[PDB]
Amino acid sequence: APRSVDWREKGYVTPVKNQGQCGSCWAFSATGALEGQMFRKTGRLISLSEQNLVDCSGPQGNEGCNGGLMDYAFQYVQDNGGLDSEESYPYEATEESCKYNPKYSVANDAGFVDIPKQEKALMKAVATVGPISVAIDAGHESFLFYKEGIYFEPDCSSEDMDHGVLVVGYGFESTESDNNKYWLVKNSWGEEWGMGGYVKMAKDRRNHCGIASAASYPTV
Numbered sequence: 001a002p003r004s005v006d007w008r009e010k011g012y013v014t015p016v017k018n019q020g021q022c023g024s025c026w027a028f029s030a031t032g033a034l035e036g037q038m039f040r041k042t043g044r045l046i047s048l049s050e051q052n053l054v055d056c057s058g059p060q061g062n063e064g065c066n067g068g069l070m071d072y073a074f075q076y077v078q079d080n081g082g083l084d085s086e087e088s089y090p091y092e093a094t095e096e097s098c099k100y101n102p103k104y105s106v107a108n109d110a111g112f113v114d115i116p117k118q119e120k121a122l123m124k125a126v127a128t129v130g131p132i133s134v135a136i137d138a139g140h141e142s143f144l145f146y147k148e149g150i151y152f153e154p155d156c157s158s159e160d161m162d163h164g165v166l167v168v169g170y171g172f173e174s175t176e177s178d179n180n181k182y183w184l185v186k187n188s189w190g191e192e193w194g195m196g197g198y199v200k201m202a203k204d205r206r207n208h209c210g211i212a213s214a215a216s217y218p219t220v
């Protein structure tokens with residue numbers, strides 16, 4: 001695999017968004033991966049509606065602002081035959097009834113692929129597919145206050161993830177501890193969090209925070 005990857009440079013990634021006070025991280029993770037795969041197919045980067053997923057993907061198993069899974073979101077887009085654009089169905093950070101309109105659908109998928117639960121497999125997926133939906137243990141004060149550098153949290157769980165995010169690449173930079181590799185991760189907490197909304201998560205440190213434990217992407 002390449003030693004460094006950044007899909008933002010290839011045009012696959014919309015700007016950082018903000019989920020507000022709704023527990024809809026799974027929807028932002030899902031739209032991010034679908035935005036990448038739609039761009040791969042069509043050459044058009046179109047921001048997709050997280051509100052559409054929050055309001056409408058309950059039958060696939062999602063629970064709105066009470067949580068969800070990216071895979072259930074990809075299943076919804078397939079079952080539903082579409083997904084509205086962000087501009088057409090904007091984000092309100094509260095669960096409401098479904099208002100999906102197919103006339104404004106700008107994306108589709110034919111299912112999804114789950115990646116084996118190993119960081120080496122996640123790397124191969126990132127290197128060859130595009131941005132990848134993942135879940136991490138973000139439930140630590142250190143994650144809230146992150147400003148820069150490689151995030152490493154000794155109390156992080158590789159099994160109990162609570163936050164869906166998007167891996168857009170990976171790379172390295174020299175550090176004191178010589179644990180130099182990182183996953184480049186797009187969050188959904190606005191650009192005032194972290195490094196313009198991004199975090200470099202420790203890579204090849206025993207599946208730190210569970211980043212390879214729930215990785216997937218939509219088939220377009």
Ligand SMILES: *[C@@H](C(=O)NCCc1ccccn1)[C@H](O)C(=O)N[C@@H](Cc1ccccc1)C(=O)N(C)C
Nearest residue numbers: 023024025026067068135138139161162163164214
């Ligand atoms: C994610 C979310 O919206 N998190 C925002 C609040 C927050 C603040 C600080 C730290 C962490 N979180 C939702 O809570 C959500 O959908 N959670 C999912 C993430 C997930 C896990 C495994 C596989 C896919 C997605 C979740 O915790 N579970 C168990 C589904």
